[PDB]
Design a protein around this nucleic acid. Structure first.
Ligand SMILES: [Mg+2]
Ligand SMILES: [Mg+2]
Ligand SMILES: [Mg+2]
Ligand SMILES: [Mg+2]
Ligand SMILES: [Zn+2]
Lengths: 130, 37, 136, 135, 94
RNA sequence: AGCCAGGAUGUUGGCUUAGAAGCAGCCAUCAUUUAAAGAAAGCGUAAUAGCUCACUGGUCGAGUCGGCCUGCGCGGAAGA
């Protein structure tokens, strides 16, 4: 993450939540590769061949990289509150895959409080596709 | 317990320390690595 | 090993060992190991270092030796009283003055060349250290 | 759970003698084993094995979702010998060709996780050079 | 962008230049064409971090001596035979 | 650095392997999910099964990790 690579990362955190504006939590606390496939390969099969969640989850990697869109990002910094992005979606069906993968084989990484883009909570949101 | 005047590290857990005028080499999980200068 | 195929006359004097070097810089390849101390190199030590460094290069690249021993050192035989002449040549020695290079290498990269020259440094009586290829 | 591929030949029940009791160590029994073991292979042929995911249970009724034969052995019938590749840098024996893998990759395409064909062709060209059959 | 800041030596020769070598400096010479040989000193460690590039020996150098930015190129260099140092440089007026 | 959890498999590197699924070699080292899982740097066997290292996802509130030239010091250093 140099100057010329966090420039690409701020390009990513402009153009990645400019259209699908969701950020969330997933981290290697039940991180074993085949167990990680329960989120990763299933998100890849839900998407095309381009699945990218790729994470840079830290305290001081928040207020400098985010600040074009959704400036409530000051509650993602400490305590491993992570970075999961969806390029399409608006409280879509993938928003609760982390809740499903925590109810089934994960050990409460960072409570996954949704990062509050429609001012969400730790629960499945109401505006969910049925 | 070697005695040598050319001590070295071998594995990734060799901890050169200095106790009482002696440059000791020790390791956590190896009886053969244990040394003395 | 190396040895003269021919000397003009049989036995040479000792001389002395003053002066700086002549073959100072790297002249052929890319990497060099260069002497620092003052001393004397026999016929055996340089070919022993040649094997001990060829064993690390693993027949790759190319290496050059420049020093070649030609001084007919002698010995007086044991239990002979000191008179009655000089002695017969026992081995052939080179003279190394401070700064003279011994070997040069190309091809094989530098981080391998650190320990690949350190092994042949550890069989040599005078302290040497590494030098690089200088563009003028 | 318990996913490392090791099994026996096809048409012979009581599946010890290649491996031994390393399948039926625990309480999962031969009635549950054999009545799917030679029963599945009326859709998958005889000569090449079948990877079935074994799993140690406490409920004792083990299930089955099957898959496709492996490329540690299958490289024989796309090449032309059961055992051929002897020391392949000095005295060569075997080779593999280019385009004949659109069959092998994506005739069983729901089993493998990839839809691009040419990035999956070299993935078994590497297995040919992993058994010696250099191109 | 390679520059040189230097001044001119007082007394020349061996015994003076050895103390000038000891005091973090080293001699040079600037000759060529119409201007006479200028016999100056240089800074040692402030050009050790400049001779580490080939643009020293392939690029123009501007020396600030006598209030005159002379435009030179590197000509020849001597070195201590068993030290990582610099000894004496030539500079042509070209 | 310290406090959660990796350290895949495409894959079961294999020639015919006592056995073969990485470590006992002389076979590529590409790659599909690529944050990655080295068709592997060491344990274990009949090869192993699983847990171990980076790989990279963490946490953390002011400094750094290892090269050059030198001043000094330390061991190497057993006697009638
Ligand atoms: Mg004590
Ligand atoms: Mg001489
Ligand atoms: Mg004098
Ligand atoms: Mg006494
Ligand atoms: Zn040890």
């Amino acid at each position: 993450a140099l100057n010329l690579q966090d420039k690409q990362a701020i390009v990513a955190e402009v153009s990645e939540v400019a259209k699908g504006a969701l950020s969330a939590v997933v981290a290697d606390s039940r991180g074993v590769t085949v167990d990680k496939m329960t989120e990763l390969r299933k998100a890849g099969r839900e998407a095309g061949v381009y699945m990218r969640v790729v994470r840079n989850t830290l305290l001081r990697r928040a207020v400098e990289g985010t600040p074009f869109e959704c400036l409530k990002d000051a509650f993602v910094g400490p305590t491993l509150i992570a970075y999961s992005m969806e390029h399409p979606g608006a409280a879509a069906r993938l928003f609760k895959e982390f809740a499903k993968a925590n109810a089934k084989f994960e050990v409460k990484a960072a409570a996954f409080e949704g990062e509050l883009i429609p001012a969400s909570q730790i629960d499945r949101l109401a505006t969910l596709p049925t | 317990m070697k005695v040598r005047a050319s001590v070295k590290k071998l594995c990734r857990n060799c901890k050169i320390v200095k106790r009482d005028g002696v440059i000791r080499v020790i390791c956590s999980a190896e009886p053969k690595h244990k040394q003395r200068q | 090993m190396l040895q003269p195929k021919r000397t003009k006359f049989r036995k040479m004097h000792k001389g002395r060992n003053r002066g700086l070097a002549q073959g100072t810089d790297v002249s052929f390849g890319s990497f060099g190991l260069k002497a620092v101390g003052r001393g004397r190199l026999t016929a055996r030590q340089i070919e022993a270092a040649r094997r001990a460094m060829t064993r690390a290069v693993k027949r790759q690249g190319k290496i050059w030796i420049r020093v070649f021993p030609d001084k007919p050192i002698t010995e007086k035989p044991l239990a002979v009283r000191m008179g009655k002449g000089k002695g017969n040549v026992e081995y052939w020695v080179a003279l190394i003055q401070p700064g003279k290079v011994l070997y040069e290498m190309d091809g094989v990269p530098e981080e391998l060349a650190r320990e690949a020259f350190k092994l042949a440094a550890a069989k040599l009586p005078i302290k040497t250290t590494f030098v690089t290829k200088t563009v003028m | 759970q318990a996913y490392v591929k090791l099994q026996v030949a096809a048409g012979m029940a009581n599946p010890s003698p290649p491996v031994g009791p390393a399948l039926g160590q625990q309480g999962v029994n031969i009635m549950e084993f054999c009545k799917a073991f030679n029963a599945k292979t009326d859709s998958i042929e005889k000569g090449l094995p079948i990877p079935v995911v074994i799993t140690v249970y406490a409920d004792r009724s083990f299930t089955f979702v099957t898959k496709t034969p492996p490329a540690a052995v299958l490289l024989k019938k796309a090449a032309g010998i059961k055992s051929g590749s002897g020391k392949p840098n000095k005295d060569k024996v075997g080779k593999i060709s280019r385009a004949q893998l659109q069959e092998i990759a994506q005739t069983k395409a729901a089993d493998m996780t990839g839809a691009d064909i040419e990035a999956m062709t070299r993935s078994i060209e590497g297995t040919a050079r992993s058994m010696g059959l250099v191109v | 962008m390679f520059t040189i800041n230097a001044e001119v030596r007082k007394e020349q020769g061996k015994g003076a230049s050895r103390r000038l070598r000891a005091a973090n400096k080293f001699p040079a010479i600037i000759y060529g064409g119409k201007e006479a040989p200028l016999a100056i000193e240089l800074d040692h460690d402030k050009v050790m971090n400049m001779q580490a590039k080939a643009e020293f020996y392939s690029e123009v150098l501007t020396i600030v001596v006598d209030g005159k930015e002379i435009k030179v190129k590197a000509q020849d260099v001597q070195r201590h035979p068993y030290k990582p140092k610099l000894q004496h440089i030539d500079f042509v007026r070209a």
